[PDB]
Structures are given as structure tokens and as C-alpha cells.
Write a protein that binds this ligand. Structure first.
Ligand SMILES: CCCCCCCCCCCCCCCCCC(=O)OC[C@H](COP(=O)([O-])OCC[N+](C)(C)C)OC(=O)CCCCCCCCCCCCCCCCC
Ligand SMILES: CCCCCCCCCCCCCCCCCC(=O)OC[C@H](COP(=O)([O-])OCC[N+](C)(C)C)OC(=O)CCCCCCCCCCCCCCCCC
Ligand SMILES: CCCCCCCCCCCCCCCCCC(=O)OC[C@H](COP(=O)([O-])OCC[N+](C)(C)C)OC(=O)CCCCCCCCCCCCCCCCC
Ligand SMILES: NC(=O)C1=CN([C@@H]2O[C@H](COP(=O)(O)OP(=O)(O)OC[C@H]3O[C@@H](n4cnc5c(N)ncnc54)[C@H](OP(=O)(O)O)[C@@H]3O)[C@@H](O)[C@H]2O)C=CC1
Ligand code: SF4
Ligand SMILES: [Zn+2]
Lengths: 51, 172, 49, 69, 116, 144, 64, 51, 162, 106, 338, 57
């Protein structure tokens, strides 16, 4: 995939799956932190695309 | 050039580049500009008929260059081609050929530029602006036509055709 | 087809074998299979359900 | 492009004739030049546009152009 | 179906390979670099849990910080791409013919070459 | 070889797809262009001269659909194909340029190498549709 | 309080890409059916980051 | 830390100079040296840091 | 026949709802607009009858033409009417909208908004008082409530509609 | 001229550039005509800008698009590509999970 | 009886043409166009209707076919009482019947009621009134006494009944009519938009069609009114060329750029499912039955050329109605500006 | 006046919003146009799991 928006969406889903692995392996706390941080980043990334 | 037609009033090719690298460019002639027009100054006065004729020719050239863009954005390409629209507007100009006052011609050129700008920026409606591009004695291409009065009044003169078809309602 | 029938047979045997080894040949002290294990109240730490 | 202008006969059309003797007045000349200009996706400079007298000069100019597509 | 250690080592190296593979758009490379940092984050947490080591969790949050600063730098560098006459697709910033691009075509800014 | 004339698009396409030529030259003609009279003679002469090509002439007036299928824009058109893939295209009437294009395509193809099993004939649109699902399909899924 | 005058205004120079408009301006219709446009005001507005740069007030939509 | 300091040093390099070339007014000249320096330093730092 | 057993009651629930929340479009021309805004404020509360104004035509149920319509505005009014979500109703308020009005003999005024879009009801005054505007809106609400079942179907021998 | 570098002032004219430098026609038009443009004059620079802009889209202009040929797809609802997947999956499952499971159960 | 009808067509909306017309069945697709063709020259038009939802745009916009004081909408029409028919055409010298079995309808009794009973009542009311000069009845091109479609069978029977009751009535049989709100192009667009991947076809698509634009049927009606020799004649109206259904699919695909995909379902399954299940606009027996039948000008009667109308070609006339649904693929940078 | 003394205003508003017929403009992505509201509703109908009404309730 070469569309920037779809690349961003798939990377967001990858972050979700990384957090899911951390949850399964029983590092729950680090799932809560990682997500929010990267979530903010993803948000900013979207704005960058808009520009 | 601080004008709507200035060479720097083109839409950038990309968000980080006006054109490809190593150079610049942009289309301002066959499409609309980047910024909106904010003022349209007066035409410089023409002292004789030569200058007025040159102004008319240049206005017609700009109109012809802008025809395909207007046809695309207004969805009127099936009613007539670009060349047909140019020919119809040329018929309009030819019907305005007898003019001989240069100031009147400058005024008309100003009005023509204004109407062209209105057409190219979706200010007017397509069914309204098509009155300047429509054929004079030919049906439009997007629909069928009736040739009943051609068959019945075949060789009859114009007077007889206008006599058989009245000029007022007949109930009253 | 025959191979589909064979696959269905193997799947059914797998399913039944798993269920049989969960129901029997297995201690039943925690509630895992509903409506097949007892839902009573246990007073001792080790009571069979 | 010239097919749209139906007052011009393409059968024995010789390209050295002036536009007027082909049946095109100034407005038709401007329309035809703009149509060719759109056809090849180029622009004619103001001196070049107003200096054209026949189709041979237009053909030569388009031949010498590298941006014509 | 694969052990987590081998899986995550392979995932990190595959992420690097895919980062190299994709067309050189600065924003895409920024996103893939962020993904690489996150893969390092996950691997460090996994080994910290396996070996009962508390420094690797620190590596996780330090990765978060380093990746954040790097992302800020990347955003600024892209906006710098805006002002300079450069394309976010670096393959369009040179005249080297590329068969991977359908429509790569550059010519000199001249209307004609010969006059006489 | 010898020119095969066609007035029906479906029959001509069936003939070409059954023949599966390695080198083909298609001459699309229409009656609006007065220069098409000389193009017929040029096509006949080049067809009898060259034997590595298959020469097929299509009347656009009697087979309008063919035009849309072959992206014909300005008749007369000479479309040179290798294994169904568009080698080149010429618009206008000039025998020397047509022969030069035929010679260039012939020599370049004769200097080519194809892996076994990947040198089969393909239809024309097959090249356009392959890139359509690669570029146009995804663009239309984002804008619309 | 330091000078921020250069961040405030951006002039234009002939054939200067960095001094020109490096963006497609947002040309919006502040048209008649707008709560802040009163009844008939059709104002062609050029916005660049929600900053009003160019005005084109079309009046006469209530000329009787 | 030192790599960030070196990046800061590279950023504050002087870009435009007062010279005796008076032919370049009213024309756009692209240098592109600043962007290349920043880009290559940035990505080399990224690769070294991750490894 | 049996479907009516479900359809006929439910119809009322469909009408009542759309009678209880009748949202007009925020659009006012000239000085019937001022009178309408008077009709919206606390002295005459449309919010009593569940009438609240929405600014976009996609969320509007009633188009309220309340001012003079010029030849410059007719395509815009046509587009605004076309871009409203169905079902929709149109109220014509004041003389300039019902007919030409005080500018019927002018060169730039549409001689009635019903030459461009269909009109469901007309309010005559110049300006019609907020009393009269509320009267017209209430009449339209009752009419559109009753409009779903006006006895179009015939009853068979079992007293069942079609 | 004070505060103007090497620009010199001649008779009847202040001068706009350093000596022996080429005079620019666009800047002449800018100075003489502040905002007045009688018509969009197409100079060499304007035509060159147009050519530069249109060269970016040369591939689209030269693209030869073929019209579609309609057909009635009789096999669309069979979903053959999903049956191949099913055959592959059941073969793999039987040859790996099935044999081992049956042997271990026995 | 007198078939003469003198009127002035050189006027505008506020003129007086001299035609007072009643149009039945104007709550469909033809209605607004026929009414506008009559009332745009200054005629008086009356629209009797009994429409399920009175607030639907199919009723309100009928008021736009003429000006204030010229167009009237008669509501709650019985379609069963002779008095209402007499009241509808009391002062009308022109009557047009557009009533016909709707596409959703699959009941034979309702089809006969729409195509035979109502037409017979209209013709009988016209015969009683001595001031009616011309009556134009709308039928179908493929109408036949042995048609598997109940619509075409009942339309042939209605032709017989109308010609029996009012021997000076004019019968129009359009082939298939397309426009902005039609069942040919709009249905194609909506079916492709809903079934995102395909258009459903239940046959080999070898049936023939002769599409004609809606703007040409109105001109045909006006020409027939102007021609006194068309009083007791049957006219079949179609486009210049005949296409198969597959060719129409391909032409619609090429005009818009959408790649065609025709998923095939066997005819008997579709017939059974449409027979035993509820039918609406986009799922009914009529589409399945008609897709195997040719609706073209057969040459047994007079054609559109006898009305001195030159219909527009299908590719040229259908292009403007698919401008919004054009495929958005690889385009130039200048195409971004709209 | 919706119900008795305005007791059913919210019910009437919700039912009318259900009744209104949505149209998707051309030039927009139909999938995204319909999918973003679905995701928004699914997200907003999750907040109630992040609620506390008494200790450990
Ligand atoms: C997409 C669908 C993915 C399905 C599989 C997800 C991973 C496995 C299930 C989650 C999990 O590990 O839960 C147990 C773990 C906790 O482990 P645990 O201790 O409860 O595990 C059960 C106990 N044993 C191991 C003995 C059987 O759950 C979490 O960490 C919380 C997960 C929250 C997920 C929030 C939503 C994410 C998006 C959806
Ligand atoms: C290990 C797990 C099972 C893997 C099954 C693989 C099946 C596909 C193999 C194959 O050749 O496919 C080609 C076939 C296509 O073959 P075909 O049937 O279309 O044949 C024509 C092929 N051409 C046109 C190239 C000549 O594709 C599929 O079967 C698609 C499979 C889709 C679903 C796969 C899901 C896997 C992951 C599931 C996670 C839960
Ligand atoms: C893409 C734009 C930038 C995205 C930035 C990051 C966004 C993060 C998520 C924000 C919310 C919006 C996403 C969800 C809705 C859209 C789904 C999507 O993107 O599908 C794309 C994907 C892919 O898009 P596609 O199918 O159009 O792409 C085709 C392939 N290419 C890219 C080549 C054109 O969609 C599908 O695979 C099919 C549709 C599946 C939709 C399944 C979810 C629907 C919504 C359910 C409710 C939401 C989830 C549950 C609630 C939330 C958790 C508690
Ligand atoms: N459009 C086409 O493609 C072609 C159409 N025709 C015929 O031309 C005529 C007009 O066409 P068109 O407008 O498109 O068709 P429609 O199906 O859209 O309209 C049918 C009209 O008849 C009315 N009607 C239907 N059933 C009954 C009934 N039982 N009692 C009373 N009125 C009824 C409908 O009103 P309501 O349902 O609201 O009561 C509506 O006004 C029809 O007879 C049609 O079959 C012929 C050839 C081609
Ligand atoms: S009808 Fe009269 S009072 Fe009302 S808006 Fe018109 S001018 Fe004002
Ligand atoms: Zn019978």
C-alpha cells in the first residue's frame, strides 16, 4: 500500500496489535501507556497529512 | 504582477513545490487562478478603431482558451463541442461588428471580461450562461428536435411562415 | 466428496475426544462446563462438581 | 481540428493559402488557432499568435516545438 | 505458532527491511521509523520479563522519549521540505531514470532547441 | 504478407485473438480524412514487402467500437504490436516513417529474450487493465 | 518581549517561490444561507489558516 | 545527547550571504544543501541508535 | 390486508414524531426575516411546539421563504430546496415571497417563489405578524400530521384498507 | 545612488540594476503598470511556465485507454478461489493435524 | 365528431395557448415532463391523482408545470366513480392518459385495473363529453396479447378498449424512456452502488432495446397535437438505433469509466424468488420477465418519423446523466479544479 | 405540546431523526462517509464501562 493515510491506519492497527501482545503476555500497564502516547502521535500525523 | 492574470497566480503543482524541482511553472491561461480576483481596473482608453479591434481580438482569444474548462466544469459538453461554442460566440461578436465608437468598445470589453470571469468561477448558472454559447439556427446536440414546420412550410417564404403562425393568442 | 467426508469424520472425532476428556478422565473441582457440572454450594476446599 | 470548421474543404487543401482564402475571417482564425493550441497542449506567444498567416507556418512552429504532445 | 523471542527478533529485522523496501517518501519513512522504535519497545519489555531485569522497562520508556524527539525533528524536516523546492517523494528530486515509476519524465525548460 | 480487411470489430478481434501473431500491424481508417486513399496503397505495399508482420485493416466507420477498443484518436492510424503489446503507434500518412517504425520494432524484438512460458500472446486491453487495477482502482476507492 | 514582526507579514517578490503563495488558498462562499452573513451577502472569502486575506463581496441579491 | 547537540550545530548554519552577485534578483535559485545535510545526519543517527 | 394491522397504528407514531420536532432552516431574507426572528423569541415560543432552527439544509425539515427573491437568488433557492432531506415542506411568508409583492413590477424580482420551487402554504401579510406566522406553522404541522393517512385506500367487506 | 549598491543614475532615469546588467521586462511592466492588465499577454516566460506545468502530466495525456467489453459472468457466484483455499486447508490439516491426532488418540 | 384543435404555441408561461388539458397518471416519470410541455406555452393542466403519500415530491412538483391559475391538482380521485371522470374533463379539449401498471406490481388483477379499467373509464368519459377533440393514450412498444408479462398483455387489451370506446384516440407506444428519474439509467446506477461489485443479470442479455430520451416524447406529444391526421393512429416511439442489453451495459460502462461486471443468476431461481417474496422497485417479477423480451419498433404501425421528430442518439443523450458517477482514476493536475 | 406538557420531546426528536432519509453526496467516499459515524457510535457506546457507582460496583 502506497497511500499515506492507509499506511498510517495500518501502523495504528499494528500499534493496537502490539498492545494486544503485551496484554496477552501480561504486561498490562505498558499497554495502557504506549497506546496513548502513540495515539497522540498518530493524531498529529493525520494533521501533517492534511497539510 | 499584482493582478488576477499575473504569471505568479497559478495553483502550485504540489504542497511543497510550485512545479517540479530545478524550475517553476503553472497554468493560469486555460484554467482559473489560485487567488480570487479582487479588482478589475479600467481598460486603457483606445484612441482609434485599431486599438479597439485589438482589444476585441484578445478578449475573443482568452474566451476561446477558456472554453474547454467552462464546458467541463458546467457539464454542458454534450450540448455542443468547444469549436461550436467558439463559433456561436463569434457569431455574437460578428453581430456586434458595426460598432465604431472606441469608448463603447472598451466598455463592452470590460463587460465581456467580467462575464467570462463570472462563468469561470461558478458565479452564474449553466442554464443561464449557455445563452451566449447556443446556436442561432441549429438544434442543441443533447436532445432531439422537431422538423414539422420544415416539412409543411417547405418552399414557402418567411412571410408565409409568419402568417400561418400568428403573433398573438387566438382565444382572446 | 470422499475427502470432505474424511475431514468431517476427523473433525467430529477431534471434537468428541476433546469433550470426552474434558468431561471424564479429568478432576472436576472448578466450574468449566455449564449445565453438566453441579452448581451447588461447596463447604470444603475440595468438593467434586 | 479543421473538420469542425465546415466552410473549409479538406479534399484538395493546399497549406500555403492565407486563412482568408480558406473561408475563415479573423474570429474564425482565432478560434482555429486556439483549437490547434488546445489540441497540441501548448501556448502560442503573442507575437507568434498574431504573425500566423497560413497553416504551413503553424506546422513549422509545431514541428520545432519539443513540448508538443 | 512461533516462540515470542524468535518472533520479535524477526519482526524487528523485517520492519527494517520493509522500511528500506518502500518508496522513499519522507513521511512514510518517519512512520516506519516510529514502528521500528515500537518494535524495540516490545522486545525490551519481553526480555525484561523473561530475565527479571528492571533496566529493560526503563529502555521501553527511554525508547518512547527518543522516538518522540525524533518524530518532532521529522515533522520539522518535512515542513522544511515545504519551503525548499523539493518533493516529499525523493525519487522525483533527480533526473536518474527509474523503471519503478510509471510516469517519470523531465526535460529542459526550453520551448525549442534549434532556430535555424 | 497480405492485408486482411475488416468492417466488423468483433470478427476482426476474434481473428486476431485466434491467430495470436508475434508481430502485427493494424491500420485504422475512416472516411472523414481525405488522405486515407494513399494510406491504403502504402499499407498494401508494406504488407507485400514485409512477411514478419500480420497486416490487418479496420474500417472505423463500419466498426466504430473498434476505435474505442484500440484508443484510436486521429485516423489514419498504424498500430504496431508485439505479442499483443503495443510496440508503437503512428498517426498520419507517410510511407517512409511507417517502414522505419516497422524496421525498428522488428530489430528490437529480434534482439529480445523471453523466459520460457512467459512469451504467450495477450490481448490489447490486458495491458491497460493490469495497470488499471494497480493504480486507477485504488484511486477510485479513495476519492469515491 | 522581542520583535516578532517577520513572523507577522509575508510580502511577495517577482518570480520568488518562497515569497509567493506556496499553498492553494481556501476560496469559500460566505454565501446568503449563512448565520453570520445576514440574508443576502455572498462574500467570496480567501482564507489561509482561517486568516482573511482577499474579499469579494457580491451584493445585489436583494436589489429590487 | 552529543548527537542532538551536533544536529543543533548543523541546524544553525548560515544559509544566505551578502555577496556581489546582483543578477539573481527576481529569480528563484534552489540550493538544497541544507536539506541534504539535515536528512542524512538524521537518518544515520536513527539507524545507529536503533542498532 | 393483514399488513395494515401493523402499518395503520405505526403511521400515527411516525407522524406524531415529525409533528413534534419540526425543524426549519435558518434562512431569512429582508424583513419578514426580522418578523420571523420575533416569532422565535420567548414571547411566541416555537420551542413550545418543538420547532427549533437548524443552520444546514441536511438537518432541516421545513424551508421557510421569508423575504424578497431576486433573479440573482433563484438558482441558490432552487439548490437549497433540492439539498434538503426528504420529507420536506416549504412555507412561503410575506407578500414578496407569495407573489411579487411591493416589487411585482420590478425588473430584478421573481414574481413569487412558487415559480422556482413548490410551496405548501402561504402567509399573506407584509410583514405577517408573529401571531400569523405561528398560526401558519401550526396549520402546516396539523396538515402534515394528517397527511400520512387521508383515506386514500378503500375498505373491503372486513373493514380493512388496501 | 545612496543606499542602492552599484546602481547608477543616468540622465532622465534613476536606473534599476547594476551597470551592464540585463533589463527585465516584467519588472518594467510592474513599475509602469501597478495593477493594470489590459489582457493576459502570453510572453515567452508565460508559455514556458505553461509547458513546464503540462510536462508533469505528459504520461496521462499519452495514455492509450481501451474501452471495456461487457460479458456475463456465469461463474462469479461459485467463488472458485475460496474452494481452492478450502481444499488446500483441509489437505494441510489432514496431512499434519489429522494423522498425528488419530495416532495419538489410538 | 370534430378533431380540430387550434392553439398558439408561440407564447410563454404567462401566455394563453388555447389548450385546456387533463392528464391522468402524472404521479410517475412521464407526468411532470408531459405537463411541462403542455403548460409551458400557456395551457391549463389538471392532474387527478390518488397518491399514497401526499407530501411526496411526485405530487407537489406537478404544480410547477404551469403558473398560478393555470395548473390544478385534483386530489382523492376515486378512479371508480363516473361522476369524478366527468368532473375532471368537463372543460378540457385535450386528455392524456399516463396511467399504467407500476413496476412493483405483480398482481394480474391490479394490472388489468390499471391498464384496462381506468383507460376504459377515461375513454368512455371522453366519448360522452362533446368538447373533447384529442385523446392521447400511452401504451408499451412490446404490448402483445400473448406476452408473458401481465403489463404488456393488459396494455394491449387497454389499447383495444380505448380504440373501441373513443375511435379518435391516439396511441403512443414508447420503447423505453431514460432521463434523470427513470428506471433505466437511475436503476443501473443505484444497483451498481448497492451491489458494489456487480450488476445482477438473470439472462444472456440478448434482448433488444431502443432507448429514447424523455425530452423527445414530450415533443412527440406536441407534434401529434399539431397534426390532425394522427387522430386515430398508433405510433411506436424509439431511438435511432437498436441495442442489445449487453451493448447497453457496455455503453454505460464506457461513458462513465466504471468497469462492467455482470453476475449471472439462473432465470428460474429469480422467477421463483420474485414470485414468492415481496416486490418493490428494485426487486420484482417485471424486471425478470421483461429482460427476456424485445421492446423495439416492430414496423407494424407508424414511427417517430411520422411525427416529424428526430430523436437523439443514446450515447449522446445519456452522457449528461452520469456526470456525477464518473470513474475517478488517474487524472491531470488541472482536473483537480472543479 | 409534544405529549402532555412536553413530556415526550426527546422521544419525538429521536424518532424523527430515525425517520429522516440520509443521502450521500457524490465526490465523497461512500464507505468512509458511512463508516466514520458507525465507529463514532461504537466508541461513544463504550464510555459507560468507564463508570463507577459506589465502591467496586
Ligand atoms: C482482534 C481480536 C484479538 C483476539 C485475541 C486478543 C489477545 C488475547 C485475548 C486478550 C488477553 O490476553 O486477555 C487476557 C489479558 C490478561 O491476562 P489474564 O491473566 O486475564 O489471562 C487469563 C488467565 N490465564 C492466563 C491463566 C488463562 O487481558 C488483558 O491484558 C486485558 C486486555 C484488554 C483489551 C482491550 C481492548 C483491545 C482492543 C479490542
Ligand atoms: C496454513 C493455513 C491455511 C492456508 C491455506 C492457503 C490457501 C490458498 C493457497 C492457494 O494456492 O491459494 C490460491 C487461491 C487462488 O487460486 P484460484 O482458485 O483463484 O485459481 C486461479 C488462480 N490464478 C488466477 C492465479 C490462475 O487463493 C486462495 O485460495 C485465497 C485464500 C484466501 C484466504 C486465506 C486465509 C489464510 C489466513 C487465515 C487466517 C485465519
Ligand atoms: C485512514 C485515515 C487516517 C486514519 C488515522 C488513524 C485512525 C484510527 C481509528 C479512528 C476511527 C476510524 C476507523 C474505524 C472505521 C473505519 C475502518 C477502517 O479504517 O477500515 C479500513 C479498511 C481498509 O479500507 P478499504 O477497504 O477502503 O481499503 C481497500 C484497500 N486499499 C487501501 C488498497 C484501497 O477497511 C476494510 O478492511 C473493510 C471495512 C472494515 C471496517 C471494520 C470496522 C467498521 C467500524 C466498526 C466500529 C469501529 C470499531 C469498534 C469500535 C472502536 C473500538 C472500541
Ligand atoms: N417509462 C417507460 O419506460 C415506459 C413507460 N410506458 C408506459 O407509459 C405510462 C407512463 O409511464 P411512467 O410515468 O414512466 O410510469 P409509472 O409506472 O412511473 O407511473 C404509473 C402511473 O399510473 C398510476 N397508477 C398505477 N397503478 C394505478 C392504479 N391501479 N390505479 C390508478 N392509478 C394507478 C401511478 O400513480 P400511483 O401509483 O401514485 O397511484 C402513476 O401516476 C405507463 O403506463 C407506462 O407503463 C411505456 C413504455 C416505456
Ligand atoms: S412581504 Fe413585505 S414585510 Fe415581508 S419581507 Fe417582503 S417587504 Fe418585508
Ligand atoms: Zn387476454
Amino acid at each position: 500500500n502506497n497511500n499515506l493515510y492507509y499506511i498510517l491506519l495500518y501502523i495504528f492497527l499494528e500499534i493496537v496489535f502490539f498492545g494486544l501482545f503485551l496484554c496477552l503476555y501480561q504486561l498490562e500497564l505498558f499497554t495502557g501507556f504506549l497506546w496513548v502516547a502513540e495515539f497522540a502521535i498518530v493524531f498529529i500525523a493525520v494533521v501533517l497529512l492534511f497539510y | 504582477m499584482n493582478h488576477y492574470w499575473g504569471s505568479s497566480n497559478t495553483i502550485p503543482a504540489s504542497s511543497t513545490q510550485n512545479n517540479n524541482y530545478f524550475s517553476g511553472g503553472g497554468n493560469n491561461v486555460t484554467i482559473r487562478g489560485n487567488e480570487i480576483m479582487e479588482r478589475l481596473p479600467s481598460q486603457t482608453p483606445s484612441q482609434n478603431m485599431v486599438q479597439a479591434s485589438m482589444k476585441t481580438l484578445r478578449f475573443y482569444r482568452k474566451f476561446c482558451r477558456l472554453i474547454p474548462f467552462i464546458l467541463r466544469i458546467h457539464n454542458i459538453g454534450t450540448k455542443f463541442t468547444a469549436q461550436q461554442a467558439m463559433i456561436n460566440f463569434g457569431n455574437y461578436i460578428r453581430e456586434r461588428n458595426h460598432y465604431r465608437d472606441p469608448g463603447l468598445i472598451d466598455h463592452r470589453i470590460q463587460l465581456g471580461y467580467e462575464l467570462l470571469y463570472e462563468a469561470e468561477m461558478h458565479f452564474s448558472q449553466h442554464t443561464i450562461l449557455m445563452q451566449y454559447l447556443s446556436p442561432y439556427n441549429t438544434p442543441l446536440s443533447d436532445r432531439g428536435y422537431s422538423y414539422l414546420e420544415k416539412v409543411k412550410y417547405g418552399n414557402k417564404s418567411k412571410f408565409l411562415q409568419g402568417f400561418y403562425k400568428g403573433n398573438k393568442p387566438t382565444e382572446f | 466428496g470422499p475427502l470432505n467426508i474424511v475431514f468431517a469424520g476427523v473433525a467430529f472425532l477431534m471434537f468428541y475426544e476433546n469433550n470426552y476428556k474434558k468431561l471424564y478422565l479429568n478432576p472436576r473441582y472448578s466450574y468449566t462446563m455449564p449445565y453438566l457440572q453441579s452448581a451447588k454450594i461447596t463447604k470444603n476446599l475440595y468438593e467434586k462438581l | 481540428v479543421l473538420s469542425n470548421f465546415e466552410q473549409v474543404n479538406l479534399k484538395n487543401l493546399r497549406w500555403e493559402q492565407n486563412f482568408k482564402k480558406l473561408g475563415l475571417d479573423s474570429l474564425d482564425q482565432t478560434a482555429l488557432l486556439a483549437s490547434i493550441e488546445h489540441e497540441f497542449t501548448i501556448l502560442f506567444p503573442d507575437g507568434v499568435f498574431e504573425g500566423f498567416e497560413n497553416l504551413e507556418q503553424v506546422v513549422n512552429y509545431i514541428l520545432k516545438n519539443i513540448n508538443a504532445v | 505458532m512461533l516462540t515470542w523471542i524468535s518472533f520479535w527478533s524477526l519482526i524487528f529485522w523485517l520492519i527494517l527491511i520493509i522500511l528500506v523496501l518502500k518508496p522513499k517518501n519522507f513521511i512514510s519513512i518517519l512512520f516506519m521509523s516510529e514502528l521500528t522504535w515500537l518494535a524495540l519497545y516490545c522486545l525490551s519489555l519481553l526480555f525484561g520479563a523473561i530475565y527479571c531485569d528492571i533496566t529493560l522497562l526503563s529502555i521501553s520508556f527511554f525508547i518512547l522519549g527518543v522516538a518522540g524527539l525524533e518524530f518532532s525533528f521529522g515533522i520539522l524536516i518535512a515542513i522544511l521540505y515545504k519551503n525548499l523546492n523539493e518533493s516529499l517523494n525523493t525519487d522525483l528530486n533527480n533526473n536518474n531514470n527509474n523503471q519503478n515509476i510509471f510516469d517519470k519524465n523531465f526535460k529542459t525548460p526550453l520551448e525549442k532547441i534549434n532556430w535555424q | 504478407s497480405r492485408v486482411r480487411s475488416f468492417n466488423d470489430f468483433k470478427a476482426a478481434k476474434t481473428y486476431i485473438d485466434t491467430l495470436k501473431p508475434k508481430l502485427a500491424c493494424l491500420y485504422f481508417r475512416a472516411d472523414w480524412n481525405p488522405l486515407c486513399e494513399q494510406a491504403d496503397k502504402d499499407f498494401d505495399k508494406l504488407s507485400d514487402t514485409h512477411l514478419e508482420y500480420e497486416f490487418v485493416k479496420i474500417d472505423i466507420d463500419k466498426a466504430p467500437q473498434a476505435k474505442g477498443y484500440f484508443a484510436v484518436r486521429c485516423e489514419p492510424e498504424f498500430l504496431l504490436l508485439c505479442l499483443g503489446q503495443e510496440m508503437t503507434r503512428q498517426t498520419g500518412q507517410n510511407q517512409r516513417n511507417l517502414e522505419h517504425r516497422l524496421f525498428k520494432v522488428q530489430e528490437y524484438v529480434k534482439g529480445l529474450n523471453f523466459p520460457a512460458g512467459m512469451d504467450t500472446y495477450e490481448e490489447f486491453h490486458e495491458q491497460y487493465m493490469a495497470e488499471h487495477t494497480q493504480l486507477d482502482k485504488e484511486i477510485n476507492e479513495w476519492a469515491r | 518581549m522581542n520583535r516578532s514582526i517577520f513572523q507577522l507579514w509575508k510580502p511577495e517578490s517577482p518570480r520568488s517561490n518562497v515569497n509567493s503563495k506556496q499553498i492553494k488558498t481556501m476560496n469559500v462562499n460566505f454565501g446568503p444561507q449563512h448565520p453570520a452573513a445576514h440574508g443576502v451577502l455572498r462574500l467570496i472569502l480567501q482564507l489561509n489558516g482561517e486568516i482573511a486575506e482577499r474579499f469579494d463581496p457580491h451584493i445585489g441579491l436583494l436589489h429590487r | 545527547l552529543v548527537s542532538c547537540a551536533i544536529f543543533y550545530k548543523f541546524i544553525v548554519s548560515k544559509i544566505s550571504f551578502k555577496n556581489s552577485n546582483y543578477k539573481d534578483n527576481y529569480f528563484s535559485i534552489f540550493s538544497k544543501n541544507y536539506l541534504n545535510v539535515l536528512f542524512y545526519q538524521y537518518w544515520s543517527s536513527f539507524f545507529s541508535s536503533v542498532m | 390486508m393483514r399488513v395494515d394491522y401493523i402499518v395503520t397504528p405505526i403511521n400515527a407514531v411516525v407522524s406524531w414524531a415529525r409533528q413534534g420536532s419540526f425543524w426549519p432552516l435558518t434562512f431569512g431574507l429582508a424583513c419578514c426575516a426580522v418578523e420571523m426572528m420575533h416569532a422565535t423569541v420567548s414571547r411566541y415560543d416555537f420551542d413550545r411546539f418543538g420547532v427549533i432552527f437548524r443552520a444546514t439544509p441536511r438537518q432541516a425539515d421545513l424551508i421557510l421563504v421569508a423575504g424578497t427573491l431576486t433573479n440573482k437568488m433563484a438558482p441558490g433557492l432552487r439548490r437549497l430546496y433540492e439539498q434538503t432531506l426528504d420529507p420536506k415542506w416549504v412555507l412561503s411568508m410575506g407578500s414578496c415571497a407569495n407573489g411579487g409583492g411591493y416589487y411585482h413590477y420590478s425588473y430584478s424580482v421573481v414574481r413569487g417563489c412558487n415559480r422556482i420551487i413548490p410551496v405548501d402554504i402561504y402567509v399573506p401579510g407584509c410583514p405577517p405578524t408573529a401571531e400569523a406566522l405561528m398560526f401558519g406553522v401550526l396549520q402546516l404541522q396539523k396538515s402534515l400530521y394528517r397527511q400520512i393517512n387521508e383515506g386514500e385506500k378503500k375498505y373491503n367487506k372486513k373493514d380493512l384498507t388496501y | 545612488v545612496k543606499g542602492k549598491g552599484s546602481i547608477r543614475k543616468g540622465i532622465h532615469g534613476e536606473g534599476f540594476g547594476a551597470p551592464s546588467h540585463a533589463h527585465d521586462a516584467l519588472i518594467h511592466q510592474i513599475k509602469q503598470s501597478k495593477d493594470t492588465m489590459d489582457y493576459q499577454n502570453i510572453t515567452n516566460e508565460v508559455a514556458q511556465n505553461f509547458a513546464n506545468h503540462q510536462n508533469n502530466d505528459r504520461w496521462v495525456y499519452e495514455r492509450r485507454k481501451s474501452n471495456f467489453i461487457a460479458q456475463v459472468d456465469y461463474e462469479y457466484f461459485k467463488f472458485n478461489h475460496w474452494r481452492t483455499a478450502w481444499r488446500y486447508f483441509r489437505n494441510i490439516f489432514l496431512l499434519t493435524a489429522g494423522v498425528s491426532f488419530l495416532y495419538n488418540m489410538e | 365528431r370534430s378533431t380540430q384543435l387550434k392553439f398558439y404555441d408561440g407564447g410563454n408561461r404567462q401566455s394563453i395557448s388555447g389548450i385546456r388539458a387533463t392528464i391522468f397518471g402524472a404521479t410517475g416519470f412521464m407526468g411532470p415532463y408531459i405537463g411541462a410541455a403542455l403548460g409551458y406555452i400557456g395551457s391549463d393542466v389538471i392532474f387527478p391523482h390518488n397518491h399514497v403519500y401526499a407530501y411526496d415530491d411526485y405530487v407537489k412538483e406537478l404544480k410547477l408545470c404551469a403558473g398560478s391559475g393555470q395548473s390544478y391538482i385534483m386530489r382523492h380521485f376515486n378512479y371508480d366513480d363516473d361522476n369524478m371522470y366527468d368532473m375532471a374533463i368537463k372543460n378540457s379539449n385535450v386528455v392524456i392518459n399516463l396511467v399504467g401498471s407500476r413496476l412493483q406490481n405483480k398482481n394480474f388483477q391490479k394490472a388489468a385495473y390499471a391498464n384496462i379499467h381506468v383507460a376504459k373509464k377515461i375513454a368512455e368519459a371522453c366519448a360522452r363529453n362533446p368538447n373533447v377533440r384529442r385523446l392521447i393514450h400511452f401504451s408499451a412498444a412490446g404490448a402483445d396479447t400473448k406476452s408473458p408479462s401481465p403489463d404488456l398483455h393488459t396494455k394491449f387489451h387497454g389499447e383495444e378498449a380505448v380504440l373501441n370506446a373513443f375511435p379518435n384516440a391516439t396511441i403512443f407506444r414508447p420503447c423505453t424512456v431514460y432521463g434523470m428519474q427513470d428506471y433505466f439509467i437511475r436503476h443501473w446506477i443505484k444497483e451498481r452502488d448497492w451491489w458494489y461489485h456487480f450488476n445482477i443479470v438473470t439472462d444472456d442479455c440478448t434482448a433488444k432495446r431502443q432507448p429514447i430520451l424523455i425530452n423527445d416524447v414530450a415533443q412527440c406529444v406536441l407534434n401529434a397535437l399539431k397534426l390532425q391526421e394522427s387522430a386515430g393512429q398508433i405510433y411506436e416511439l424509439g431511438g435511432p438505433h437498436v441495442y442489445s442489453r449487453l451493448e447497453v451495459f457496455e455503453m454505460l460502462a464506457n461513458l462513465s469509466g466504471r468497469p462492467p461486471k455482470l453476475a449471472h443468476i439462473p432465470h428460474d431461481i429469480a422467477l421463483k424468488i420474485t414470485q414468492n417474496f415481496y416486490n418493490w422497485e428494485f426487486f420484482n417479477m417485471e424486471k425478470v420477465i421483461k429482460d427476456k423480451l424485445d421492446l423495439i419498433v416492430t414496423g407494424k404501425h407508424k414511427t417517430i418519423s411520422d411525427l416529424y421528430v428526430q430523436p437523439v442518439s443514446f450515447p449522446q443523450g445519456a452522457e449528461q446523466f452520469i456526470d456525477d458517477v464518473r470513474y475517478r482514476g488517474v487524472e491531470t493536475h488541472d482536473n483537480l479544479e472543479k | 405540546y409534544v405529549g402532555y406538557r412536553g413530556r415526550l420531546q426527546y422521544i419525538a426528536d429521536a424518532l424523527k431523526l430515525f425517520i429522516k432519509g440520509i443521502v450521500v453526496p457524490e465526490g465523497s467516499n461512500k464507505f468512509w462517509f458511512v463508516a466514520i459515524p458507525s465507529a463514532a457510535g461504537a466508541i461513544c457506546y463504550t464510555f459507560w464501562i468507564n463508570s463507577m457507582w459506589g465502591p467496586s460496583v
